[PDB]
RNA sequence: UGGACCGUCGUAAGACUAACUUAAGCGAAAGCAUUUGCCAAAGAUGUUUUCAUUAAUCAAGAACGAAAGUUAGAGGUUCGAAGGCGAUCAGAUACCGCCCUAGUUCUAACCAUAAACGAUGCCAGCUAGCAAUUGGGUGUAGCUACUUUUAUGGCUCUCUCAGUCGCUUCCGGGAAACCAAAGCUUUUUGGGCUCCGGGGGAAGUAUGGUUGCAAAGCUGAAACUUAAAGGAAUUGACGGAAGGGCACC
RNA sequence: AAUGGAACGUGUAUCAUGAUGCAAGCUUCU
């Protein structure tokens, strides 16, 4: 038989959430956490939580080339109105993917699972879109699929190298400039002319240890 | 590695789930799970068919925005969510009206995201094959 | 993968020369006539390692079979359950220097 | 009589293609036989765009858009007037025709 | 003579114990008493000694198996699954 | 009355008839 | 009854590959859309390889054979026959709304049937333009990708087979709708071969045989009934099928 | 009948021989 006062809003504290270092704006917010009781661990009720904001907005690219690319954060550690927020994942907006994908083209999907230098084992989904040649009288441009298989073989070959090049930090940096997309592009076009390529989704789920010392490197 | 200065523009996450038959504007912790003031369009109007209405949704968004603003969430990033699924997948009519009403309460906006989780492939949508006539 | 040896063993049967079975294979291993020794995956643990060690001291190369006895024997085309082979002189082979 | 040369829709050399469930009746129809129309809309819909841009911090923004490719049964489509009872002559006729451009996609 | 087309082995049970039950028996009593390929001798000399135990007549390697079948359907899947998890933990 | 439902009437009637014949066997 | 519903996060379970995905492919056909590995198959192309008429098509017989239904497990998330519910409605037993069983799924067995449909047997030749479209090949002194340029690859461009179709015309057929096959079906004829129909109903029923665990399925009458029946196009009438107009009934 | 806590050597991760926390100390077809 609990029964709390009312206006529990006037019982939920205040807190600042910090984004990551190598983005741009290391404030992404302030938000309203439960007041620390000795019958509630508000710090634990800040930690498990995972957020997504598109990197474009945080990066504050005014005309956003980055508009689609969705980015996940996880609120690692609580210290005096500051919450750190490491890399958790990167998805993609449904808007971009769906609009590009208009009949008349072979579609490719590739898979990699590979391990970073720290024990995050992350799975990247490379998604290939295919391009009609200039003055292609052929309205539909279809791959022979020796092509598609070979592109898939190249897609996985390129992404595996890239993952193991230093931790999530260096991995996400490759995502940011999209050097992966360019390396895909030079290699794929030898096989077959290709349009739009992105790293589409990445899920980390193995996350090694809390490893707070190396974690605090991220903390500016 | 550009430090942090105190003092606003300090964002939260709006989490709008705007479905047909009811629209929710659930403003939460930026990290997600710890909330302030869920306040649906439902308690804004008692018609049962108008719970989804953009009239209801506007009022809900306005009510929530006061609770957020007084306690020191100046601003919010926004996640919009269909029903996404073997469900309609179309955003509910109160969705746009919630979105614009949250902004027009001096709440600063930076993100409009469509989180709507899209099936790569999923079983049987309701109505079993001689499908939902009328 | 593999394929591989079903094609190879047919050629050795046709052109070349064979001794199958522990007693003859050991005799050919001792005598040095055994250019190659092939051991089933099945062979009772002892005899896998014997025949390896007669081979190690002989410096002869051991090929470890992907399949059974019936698989060995059907490959030789003999109706019999072969648990060891020595290939003693195969006349068309690139098979003399091979490891599965 | 075979009015339609294609039977239902364009099945030649496949005859049986995995069915997709119709977003209006939730039915079952093979993928060749769907009337499909591409729903392209802004999230902020018409009037509200003036109101949001002023309220929202950003220098211009440029609105995210909604994509939902809906799949209709023939029964579904003609009730909702997607396909309107053509021609013994004009069933055969492909073409389109808009005049204006900016595609309907209301309610 | 193919003496009985339908019954085969279940003619021992003749008239007693209803036809549908007797069809079930026919599969099981075939799989038991059947010579299986011993993985450890490559010879098909493995026969059912008792309910869960198959002894290979030659090499005398005696293997634990399913009650009517050397390999039960669950087992094959079981053994592949553990083996695959083994690979990922190690490297 | 449509061929399917007529066909079902005869199928239903065949099981009725089979039962009757089965009594007298 | 306050914590559904909802949000958020993870996880369990089973299912399934939206968009991409087609007048596009494969497979003898049923059927076959996630990734990757293996095993073997098929087809087009190409082959100055071989064989040297082996072939073509088929009662019987067999192989494969969606779904429901059925036997035994696993599995049961989802949808969901039956049931019981709320409205609607004279009735609802239904459409509609809820809960949901067998069932969906998978495995070992059945069954042998569907609009199993492209309503169109298969194999061969011949009889019309164009552009798509699947695949291979000949030329590319074409664009792009690169190594100092190449060599390679993909696409277009050109040319050609064999595939599936379309468009518009027949240059024939047809009663027409249509059909590049439904043409060459003759002037009572045309390669070869099967199968099926010979008024409509009774009737895919009866009956027996057969197959099936069973449900059923195959083979399949007649009595008797009856002057029409079917398909087509045409014009009207009529729509709670679709678009325009016109009038202060 | 080998519990808990540490002590020899190792090494990764962090910082310029030492310190710091986590791994290691021990025989794998047969």
TrEMBL record, chain C:
Residues 6-96 form the Ribosomal protein eL8/eL30/eS12/Gadd45 domain. Pfam families: Ribosomal_L7Ae (PF01248). The keyword NAD does not apply. PROSITE patterns: RIBOSOMAL_L30E_1, RIBOSOMAL_L30E_2. One of its GO terms (molecular function) is RNA binding. GO terms for cellular component: cytosolic large ribosomal subunit; cytosolic ribosome. This is Large ribosomal subunit protein eL30. InterPro entries: Ribosomal_eL30, Ribosomal_eL30-like, Ribosomal_eL30-like_sf, Ribosomal_eL30_CS, Ribosomal_eL8/eL30/eS12/Gad45. Keywords: Ribonucleoprotein, Ribosomal protein. Signal peptide: none annotated. The gene is RpL30. GO terms for biological process: cytoplasmic translation. Belongs to the eukaryotic ribosomal protein eL30 family. The lineage of its organism: Eukaryota, Metazoa, Ecdysozoa, Arthropoda, Hexapoda.
From TrEMBL, chain F:
It comes from Drosophila melanogaster. Belongs to the eukaryotic ribosomal protein eS32 family. It holds the Pfam family Ribosomal_L41. GO terms for molecular function: structural constituent of ribosome. This is 60S ribosomal protein L41. Residues 1-25 are annotated as: Disordered. One of its GO terms (cellular component) is cytosolic large ribosomal subunit. The keyword Iron-sulfur does not apply. The keyword Ribonucleoprotein applies. The gene is RpL41.
């Amino acid at each position: 038989g609990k029964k709390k006062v009312v206006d529990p809003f006037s019982r939920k504290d205040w807190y600042d959430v910090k984004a990551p270092n190598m983005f741009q704006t290391r404030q992404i917010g302030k938000t309203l956490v439960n007041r620390t009781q000795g019958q509630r661990i508000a710090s634990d009720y800040l930690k498990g939580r995972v957020f997504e904001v598109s990197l474009a907005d945080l990066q504050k690219d005014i005309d956003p080339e980055r508009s689609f690319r969705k980015f996940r954060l996880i609120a690692e550690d609580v210290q005096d109105r500051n919450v750190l927020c490491n890399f958790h994942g990167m998805d993609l907006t449904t808007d971009k993917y769906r609009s590009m994908v208009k009949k008349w083209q072979t579609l490719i999907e590739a898979i990699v699972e590979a391990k970073t230098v720290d024990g995050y084992l992350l799975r990247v989904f490379c998604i290939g879109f295919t391009a009609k040649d200039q003055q292609s009288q052929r309205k539909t441009c279809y791959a022979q699929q020796s092509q598609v298989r070979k592109i898939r073989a190249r897609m996985t070959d390129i992404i595996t190298n890239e993952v193991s090049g230093a931790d999530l930090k260096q991995l996400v940096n490759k995502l940011a400039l999209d050097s992966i997309a360019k390396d895909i592009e030079k290699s794929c076009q030898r096989i077959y002319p290709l349009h739009d390529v992105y790293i589409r989704k990445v899920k980390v789920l193995k996350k090694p240890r809390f490893d707070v010392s190396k974690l605090l490197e991220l903390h500016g | 590695g550009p430090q942090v200065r105190d003092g606003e523009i300090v964002f939260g996450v709006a989490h709008i789930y705007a479905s047909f038959n009811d629209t929710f504007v659930h403003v939460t912790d930026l990290s997600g799970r710890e909330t302030i003031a869920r306040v649906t369009g439902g308690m804004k109007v008692k018609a049962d068919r108008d719970e989804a209405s953009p009239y209801a949704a506007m009022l809900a968004a306005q009510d929530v925005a006061e609770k957020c603003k007084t306690l020191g969430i100046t601003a919010l990033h926004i996640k919009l969510r269909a029903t996404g699924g073997n469900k309609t997948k179309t955003p509910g009519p109160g969705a746009q009206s919630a979105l614009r009403a949250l902004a027009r309460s001096s709440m600063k906006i930076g993100r409009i995201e469509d989180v709507t989780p899209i099936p790569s492939d999923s079983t049987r949508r309701k109505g079993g094959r001689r499908g939902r006539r009328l | 993968a593999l394929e591989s040896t079903n094609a190879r063993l047919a050629l050795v049967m046709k052109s070349g020369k064979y001794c199958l079975g522990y007693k003859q294979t050991l005799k050919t291993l001792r005598q040095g006539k055994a250019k190659l020794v092939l051991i089933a995956s099945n062979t009772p643990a002892l005899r896998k390692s014997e025949i390896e060690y007669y081979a190690m001291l002989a410096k002869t190369e051991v090929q470890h079979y992907s399949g059974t006895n019936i698989e060995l024997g059907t490959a030789c085309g003999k109706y019999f359950r072969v648990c060891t082979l020595s290939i003693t002189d195969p006349g068309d082979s690139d098979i003399i220097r091979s490891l599965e | 009589t075979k009015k339609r040369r294609n039977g239902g829709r364009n099945k030649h050399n496949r005859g049986h293609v995995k069915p997709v469930r119709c977003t209006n009746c939730a039915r079952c129809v093979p993928k060749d036989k769907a009337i499909k129309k591409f729903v392209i809309r802004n999230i902020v819909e018409a009037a509200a765009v003036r109101d949001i841009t002023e309220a929202s911090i950003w220098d211009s923004y440029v609105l995210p858009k909604l994509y939902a490719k809906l799949h209709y049964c023939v029964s579904c489509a003609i009730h909702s007037k997607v396909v309107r009872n053509r021609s013994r002559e004009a069933r055969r006729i492909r073409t389109p025709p808009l005049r204006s451009f900016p595609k309907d996609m209301a309610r | 003579a193919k003496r009985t087309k339908k019954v085969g082995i279940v003619g021992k049970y003749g008239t007693r114990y209803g036809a549908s039950l007797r069809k079930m028996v026919k599969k099981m009593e075939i799989t038991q008493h059947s010579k299986y390929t011993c993985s450890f001798c490559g010879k098909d000399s493995m026969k059912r000694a008792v309910v869960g135990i198959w002894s290979c007549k030659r090499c005398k390697r005696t293997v634990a198996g399913g009650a009517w079948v050397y390999s039960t359907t669950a087992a094959a899947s079981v053994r592949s699954a553990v083996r695959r998890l083994r690979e990922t933990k190690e490297q | 009355m449509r061929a399917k439902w007529r066909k079902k009437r005869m199928r239903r009637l065949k099981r009725k008839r089979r039962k009757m014949r089965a009594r007298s066997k």
